[PDB]
């Protein structure tokens, strides 16, 4: 599918759970805690950029936040937890400015999904886009889906029709792409993520 739309104002759910990194996307699941790709977290640790809470073209800014620590998923899956320091250098509270997206606990082939992130973020001044498609394949912690994606979509949450989190985009076939790959969250991955949410 190639069906995309700018989210001009990302202050409402679930858009206010999406975060921009300098080169990718993530999603907020709990206190100070973002899920993204392992590769996005790692690249961001070279340049040590802050995370921008739900950056969009219009609407009140949610703050930029310093990265506190990273927990990489031990296995092969391109998955990592990024923790942020809660208070920005302007006094904004990370938690007051995002939502915590709940888990879908799986999906089925043929389900209609959305991928929300920052395709070509550096060139667009980090406009948020939602792109719609379908899940075409699921196997263990892998899924394939046909929502249009571009570089900058890494780490993008893949949401079901009730805005619940199925997994995150990590790679494609292109770059630039209509056959994309995600990390699909099984119970074991949901457990790793939930054990790494700040208390
Ligand atoms: Cl605040």
Swiss-Prot record:
Gene Ontology process terms (BP): proteolysis
Active-site residues, record numbering mapped to chain: 39 (charge relay system), 78 (charge relay system), 154 (charge relay system)
Matching Gene3D superfamilies: Trypsin-like serine proteases
Any one Gene Ontology cellular component term annotated for this protein: extracellular region
Pfam families: Trypsin
SUPFAM superfamilies per UniProt: Trypsin-like serine proteases
Class in the EC hierarchy, top level: hydrolase
PROSITE patterns noted in UniProt: V8_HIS
The keyword Signal belongs to this UniProt entry's keyword annotation: yes
Compartment(s): Secreted
GO MF term (any one): serine-type endopeptidase activity
InterPro entries to which the protein is assigned, alphabetical: Peptidase_S1_PA, Peptidase_S1_PA_chymotrypsin, Peptidase_S1B, Peptidase_S1B_tx, Trypsin_dom, V8_his_AS
Induction: Positively regulated by agr (accessory gene regulator).
Entry's EC annotation: 3.4.21.-
Alphabetical keyword list: Hydrolase, Protease, Secreted, Serine protease, Signal
Family: Belongs to the peptidase S1B family.
Protein name as annotated: Serine protease SplA
UniProt source species: Staphylococcus aureus (strain NCTC 8325 / PS 47)
Lineage: Bacteria, Bacillati, Bacillota, Bacilli, Bacillales
Gene that this polypeptide is encoded by: splA
């Amino acid at each position: 599918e190639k069906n995309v739309k700018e989210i001009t104002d990302a202050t409402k759910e679930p858009y206010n759970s999406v975060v921009a990194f300098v080169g990718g996307t993530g999603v907020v699941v709990g206190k100070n805690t973002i899920v993204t790709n392992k590769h996005i977290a790692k690249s961001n640790d070279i340049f040590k950029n802050r995370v921008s809470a739900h950056h969009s073209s219009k609407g009140k800014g949610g703050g930029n936040y310093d990265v506190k620590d990273i927990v990489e998923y031990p296995g092969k899956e391109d998955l990592a937890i990024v923790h942020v320091h809660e208070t920005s250098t302007e006094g904004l509270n990370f938690n007051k400015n995002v939502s915590y997206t709940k888990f879908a606990d799986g999906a089925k082939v043929k389900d209609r999904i959305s991928v929300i992130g920052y395709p070509k973020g550096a060139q667009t001044k980090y406009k948020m886009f939602e792109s719609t498609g379908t899940i075409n394949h699921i196997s263990g912690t892998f899924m394939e889906f046909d929502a249009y994606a571009q570089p900058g979509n890494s780490g993008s949450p893949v949401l079901n029709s009730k805005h619940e989190l199925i997994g995150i985009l990590y790679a494609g076939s292109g770059d630039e792409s209509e056959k994309n790959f995600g990390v699909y969250f099984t119970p074991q991955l949901k457990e790793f993520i939930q054990n790494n949410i700040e208390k």
